[PDB]
């Protein structure tokens, strides 16, 4: 079990760690988060009490280094940093643990929620979507735009999700216009899975990461990406059975975790009604259809 210590907490802030959150007061003696489960990516995220504008945060994996949080009064945010001196870091953490100035990652033993939301998410793939190669962790915030959003403006600060566009030459084979537009199987299976993502695990990993950025930061372009990747599968008549079964599980846990009060802005009515009731896969997402109907019947 790993630890992300905090130098201090000079400004009042709500801190998130994965799907959990807690309030820290101005200059409260808070010095980090312990008992973080090894084996998963994690995200530590922030919303200042004075400016709910810009939720921001850091994706990381404690197997890749010793990370800590420090407040920068010039740039005005909590920054993740990496400590190369492993002895200094063990010494800093033990001191914090003995004075009991850390919150414990509060996982219920029965609870597989975080695993189910990050099953296919890998830190190495996050770092290709979020390009900043000098760090082992990745910053995301509410305002960052995606590569595709920029085509329709600072490139260093963009989310490089895979571009999906249903009315594009990449999606539509010359001579198969009607066929490829109404059944997107060649775009899903040949262009995207075989060509770009290489396997369904990498596709699901990007889909899961897009959802989590939409949920935790309200990142609009991430929400667009999540829905596009769902729609590309549901609009394909020919999808491997194991992919459909896994998609049903992925979406079930995403819909289960979504805050009940954010469904209006994070769920696209058109996509969900098409996917559950009109698409080729209208009958292949039983768990997802059941939770959607019981939790968000208004949207449908």
């Amino acid at each position: 079990m790993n630890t992300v210590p905090f130098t201090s907490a000079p400004i009042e802030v709500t801190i998130g760690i994965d799907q959990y959150s807690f309030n820290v007061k101005e200059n409260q003696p808070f010095h980090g988060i312990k008992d973080i489960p090894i084996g998963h990516v994690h995200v530590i995220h922030f919303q200042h009490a004075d400016n709910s504008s810009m939720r921001y945060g850091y994706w990381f994996d404690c197997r890749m280094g010793n990370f800590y949080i420090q407040y920068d009064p010039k740039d005005g945010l909590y920054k993740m940093m990496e400590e190369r001196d492993g002895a200094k870091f063990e010494n800093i953490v033990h001191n914090f643990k003995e004075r009991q100035m850390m919150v414990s990652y509060p996982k219920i033993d029965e609870d597989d929620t975080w695993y189910n939301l990050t099953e296919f998410v890998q830190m190495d793939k996050i770092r290709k979507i979020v390009r900043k190669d000098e760090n082992q962790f990745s910053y995301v915030d509410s305002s960052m735009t995606t590569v595709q959003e920029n085509e329709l403006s600072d490139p260093a600060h963009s989310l490089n999700y895979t571009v999906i566009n249903f009315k594009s030459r990449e999606a539509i084979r010359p001579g198969h216009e009607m066929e490829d537009f109404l059944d997107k199987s060649y775009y899903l299976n040949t262009v995207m899975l075989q060509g770009i993502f290489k396997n369904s695990s990498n596709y699901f990993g990007e889909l899961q990461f897009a959802f989590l950025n939409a949920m935790f930061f309200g990142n609009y372009g991430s929400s667009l990406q999540w829905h596009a990747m769902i729609e590309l599968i549901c609009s394909s008549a020919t999808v491997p059975k194991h992919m459909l079964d896994k998609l049903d599980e992925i979406l079930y846990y995403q819909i289960k975790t979504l805050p009940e009060q954010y469904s209006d802005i994070l769920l696209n009515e058109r996509v969900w009604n098409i996917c559950l009731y009109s698409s080729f896969q209208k009958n292949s997402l039983h768990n997802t259809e059941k939770i959607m109907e019981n939790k968000y019947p208004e949207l449908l």
């Binding site: 009315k167 594009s168 030459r169 539509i172 216009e177 009607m178 537009f181």
Partner: protein
């Protein structure tokens, strides 16, 4: 964006544009079967592709053999239309290709957009005008060439005859849409108006009669009377 009453004169500027109407592409007669069920029989149709500035009409005849063995024909018809419009554009020299294509029905937007991906600089636009191009098969010479076709065929016409020698495009389009609106509202009456006086003939190379300027005013008045009438006969006013 969408074409409406507010940007109407855009149709007659010097940017090449085409209207595409797909109403008459997939045409059927509905009938009873010996068992007393209902079936359709397709008949030949046509794509109506019109340059409103010059009057040039590219009439692509859709022969019933294109539907043989196909399913969901009303959906296929929109994609066949887009295929044929795209093939027409590719067949034209670059300087004759349109800068915009205006579809008369919004369901043509995605089919045409997808078939025209190779032409990103050609704008595909809907319209809020309720144009009467479905009545094109009430023009006898157009109906005749469609019904006689035994294979796919493109036939070229000027739907304004020689009117542009005497009037502007704007006025010619207004005459055309008045004629077609009348033909659509009451085909029998409209056609009586157009031919009542046998001394006015249709030239072999024309679609409409050879009216003098003064006779077109009388004709046009009679078409307005018909349309307003039918509008009464319909709603009782």
């Amino acid at each position: 964006g969408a074409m409406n009453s507010s940007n109407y004169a855009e149709l007659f500027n010097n940017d090449i544009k085409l209207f595409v109407d797909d109403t008459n592409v997939y045409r059927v007669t509905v009938h009873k079967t010996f068992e007393g069920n209902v079936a359709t029989k397709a008949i030949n149709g046509c794509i109506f592709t019109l340059n409103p500035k010059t009057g040039h009409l590219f009439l692509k005849i859709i022969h019933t053999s294109v539907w043989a063995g196909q399913k969901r024909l009303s959906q296929l018809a929109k994609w066949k239309t887009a295929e044929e419009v795209s093939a027409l554009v590719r067949s034209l020299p670059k300087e004759e290709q349109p800068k915009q294509i205006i579809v008369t029905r919004k369901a043509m937007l995605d089919p045409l957009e997808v078939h025209m991906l190779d032409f990103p600089n050609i704008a595909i636009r809907p319209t809020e005008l309720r144009l009467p191009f479905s009545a094109a098969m009430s023009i006898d010479k157009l109906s005749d060439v469609v019904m006689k076709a035994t294979e796919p065929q493109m036939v070229l016409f000027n739907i304004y005859d020689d009117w542009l020698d005497r009037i502007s495009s704007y006025t010619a389009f207004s005459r055309l849409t008045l004629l077609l609106r009348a033909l659509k509202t009451n085909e029998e009456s409209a056609k009586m108006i157009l031919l009542s006086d046998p001394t006015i003939t249709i030239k072999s190379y024309h679609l409409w009669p050879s009216f003098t300027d003064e006779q077109w005013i009388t004709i046009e008045s009679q078409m307005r009377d018909l349309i307003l009438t039918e509008y009464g006969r319909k709603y009782n006013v």
